[model samples]
Target: RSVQWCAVSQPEATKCFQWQRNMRKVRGPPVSCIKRDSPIQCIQAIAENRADAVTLDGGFIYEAGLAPYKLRPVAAEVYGTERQPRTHYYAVAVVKKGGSFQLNELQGLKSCHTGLRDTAGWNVPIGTLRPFLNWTGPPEPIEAAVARFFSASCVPGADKGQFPNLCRLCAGTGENKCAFSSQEPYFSYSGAFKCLRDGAGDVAFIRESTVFEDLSDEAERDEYELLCPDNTRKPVDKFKDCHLARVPSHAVVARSVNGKEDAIWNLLRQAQEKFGKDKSPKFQLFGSPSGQKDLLFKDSAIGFSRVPPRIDSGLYLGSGYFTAIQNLR
Candidate 1:
């Protein structure tokens, strides 16, 4: 049987269809595509056997692992250089040099987040800011406490109707405003950085590579800084010393029981060899077309490495991030 990939959007489904077609030419493990509304839906589809696999952010990966789905990560995206090919990233708090704020004194500031439930943008950052949030516990809803903590924020994917302040700094003017997808100008890594760069927000919650990806010049990069966990500020280059948490890279997840691991690995390994990176102009396995960001996988990811069999979703998320996610819940 073929490995069925769960796609989150129309653009992603289009890319999956292309990948499936390309696999046919190479005679790799047969591939199939299934359209789903969201990552959560994809998890349910996979659990119910409607779909076989889906690549999800680390935060969503946690959700997929819990309770009903019990999905396990079969593969992880590898970024950085080909020689290194790392599988993790650092979540850092970025701010303008002159904002003159430490991590502790950030109350009532305008914040920019990639999206709700995002690993680097939301989960890690909120976990770090929990003490300042004045949240009691579950059933109370952390969103309300967070809404009261920050004066304004551009948290794409958060419900604007329930939390107006969270969407206040979002650049999107109409329906696109604070949308979960890229339709919102401040939706992802680069977008969250843009929210801070354009002076829309005082602090931008993103990963280490965001500034370098958007601003090439060192001089421009020097104008910004990272807020360290120690309550001190350091240069943007000092993410390692001054950051929130080290999060696992996004992973391709499948059912823990009766999963199509072999076929999925076969399809992915062969696809990478044939269409990965600049291997073919006809189709790019690791890249997406213009107007779309990461379609099936991360754009610059060199390849996928098999997740160790012993590492279930909980172990894969690790203690730091795992505890962080638990704290948020």
Candidate 2:
């Protein structure tokens, strides 16, 4: 009866309190509990001589802007309920309005718009993005690369990675290892999707929900058709009648430690109790192709940009079972 109870989360403090209260009635484990700040806060607590262990969103902790430290998962909600999570990303490529490759080629791939403050959408992914793109080199010093890519209207950090007269037709943004670059830096299907659709950007990195709400009823269908068309000629069929990439699951990880592994697990168990399996809903994700995506340690050890690693690894962790759903806000 001496067990203390507390809760911690990025969610409001009141929510944590309610959840912990519910946990108290559980009939097992006579241990005390305390709500830590955030998963990172728990880590900070441990670092600054405060807390022993903390719970963090798995993705956030790993992608947090800091050198890697030893951490093990404490508790996680792999398959959440109706509560959908959100993720942000950017597409980098060059294309014209015809839904085809433009004559400008990828000269602007290294330009200003391609560099300066490009990833302001999500801080968590930004941490991951740095190393993700670091494989080839740090962002081509923005200015230098911009100069090479564009003739004028340049911005900060644009002209970095300059390739004066040489253009890698296959240059890609290398985000998810799709590997088909008539462009470079932040390149991929998503980027191409945006360019073709005249800025598929929004507050949350252009997901299905965002697109559907913003455009006309046919906009969504039209976009799918363009991005996923078959080997047909120009003036393609209806935009809605094409193929599109299916969105997989997103991770909803929480921090825990060697000591609280059981507590964290208890949370998952509790979640199961409240929400049964089966339709309880689950998720999963896939990593970038290995050889192309594997970021060598040597590259990181020596401080190289584009450290041949896979950012997709962290992404796929919680996406396994939640592939069919389309609405994740």
Candidate 3:
């Protein structure tokens, strides 16, 4: 039997092609590649059985778990070292030092988000700001509420034309302006931090590791501060006490019913054992071999852990996080 992996970008497709060949070389399960334009399209492919698996971020995992998609998380990507990877990270707000504002005083301020609907970037932050949102329904979209709350923002994956204010602070080149994907200067974690570091936005919604990851110098780290849910600020490393949520790691998902979970895990296990941790020169299971950041998975990922049958997408994402996503929706 064969297992198909959906790829959302050209580099991912190239990496998948090498993976397919390697599976044959190792005499493992046959591998196939299905190309799609976005994560939602990949979810649709897996839902229709055209593709079998694709790694998704926590936010999209929630989307995949919804009706029509009905996918389940079968494996999670672990961070940290090769032997002791972590299963979670903190979602925190990063603001430059010397700002008089706290978490409660965020109205009308320019902001940077990882992406629209992303967990740490969107859902968890919205959970903290729920009181500020008016929540007008039916005719009005949630973007309007966010647009009213923040003066301007660089929310990648949002419609630039429909919500120009949302993309007003993006620094992407001409046609790439506010465009989702790496083209947008303020698209993902590093980009969002740059949005704040470059003085484009007043605040950034990001993961706890992002600040230290971006700034190697400890002195530079002190230039920023993390805003706690308690409505106060602390040092960058104080994310444990100040984060909005402790979100689960992203997972590799497949259709809930009739998904090739066993074969999929088998294939993934071989890849990890062979090429994980930037180990093999021939291919890398966790790094960007093709020079594309997070082509198939997050570059920060270190290993994969199989999910027990008891934990579905919602359970894997945690009930509190799931509720936050629903609240944002």
Candidate 4:
């Protein structure tokens, strides 16, 4: 049977098909591409042996590593400058520089999150603010406490009917428009940052590089600042010191049992060697399609690094990030 790779979204699937076609020309092995509705489904499909591999954000990687479908990380996306690639980036909370609220004073303010289960958008921010939520105990859904704490929020991908406050600031036009899927207009890092940029929310929880990538103008960039965990604020460029957490980047995952980890790694390595941005301009492995920033891989990523043979998701993600994801669940 041919190796089947899963694409979590249509955009990814289309790009995967193009990538596969390009690979065939370079003597790269034939690959079958499978499309899934979302990351959850892709993980499940791979676990069920219907697909061989898929790329996942740090948050989903944690989820995929758990329970009935034990998956392992085979390769990691490396971001940052070409000379010095990094496996992680900082998660940060952004607010206008003139905002009166401090990190400790975020209660009752409108908030924007990239998505419900996102690493930079939801996990880091929620875990950081969990103590200030003032909840009685566990078993009470964190969403409820967050709903009460913030006057309104635009946490895309939340169940709007059950948690209206979470979607109050969303720009979706109709019911179910604020869904977790891309159907929701404000359902990603760019979307959440746009919510804050439009003044719909007081704070936006997103990755450190989002502001720089989304707002290229210096005047626009100067208007925002990071809400550091130390109750202080800093310019976005200083995220290394004033960010929520330095979280791991996206990873390619495959089922642990009877998994084609080595085959998957070889496929990715060969593809990147031929189609990587520096190798070919016609079909760059790291480039995104129109209107999509991250298709199969992160746009800014330079390459993939094979995870150590013994390293599982828990180890690759570290204890801090693992616990943050756990708290969200």
Write model 4 residue lDDT over 73-189, tens digit each, in one string: 988999877777889878899998886789889999999999986778888888778778877666888888888999999887788879988999888778756777666677789
lDDT tens readout by residue for model 1, 1-329: 89999999999999999999988987777789999999999999999999999998867888999988899999988898887778998898999997678989989988999988777898888887887889888788778898999999998888889988899998786988999887888889999999999999899999998888888999999999999888899998988777788788889999999998888898888899999878999888998888898998999788999997867888998765777787787
Error of 1 at 136 (Å): 6.6
Candidate 4 C-alpha error for residue 155, in Å:
8.1
Total backbone clashes of model 1?
Answer: 0
Q: What stretches of model 3 exceed 4 Å from their correct place?
A: 8-14, 35-38, 48-50, 94-105, 108-123, 135-144, 151-204, 210-238, 287-293
Off by over 4 Å in 4: 92-118, 134-144, 150-244
* lDDT per model vs. reference: 0.88, 0.30, 0.87, 0.85
Model 2 / residue 204 / CA error / Å: 11
Clashes of 3: 0
lDDT tens digits, residue span 1-329, model 2:
32232234423334334434544555433333455655565555443434333333334434432334344333322322235322322221222234442312323332212223333212211222232122333444423333344333222222224433222222334431223233443333344234334432211122233233434566443533222223332212332332122222222222222334444445445434542233122210111123432111111111111111233323333221111111110
Clashes of each: 0, 58, 0, 0
lDDT of 3 by residue, 82-156 (tens): 666699988889999998899889999999999998878888887778777877655787888898899999998
Error of 4 at 165 (Å): 9.1
- Compared with the true structure, model 2 gives a TM-score of 0.38
**Runs in model 1 lying further than 4 Å from the true structure:** 9-14, 80-86, 94-105, 108-119, 135-144, 151-204, 210-238, 287-293
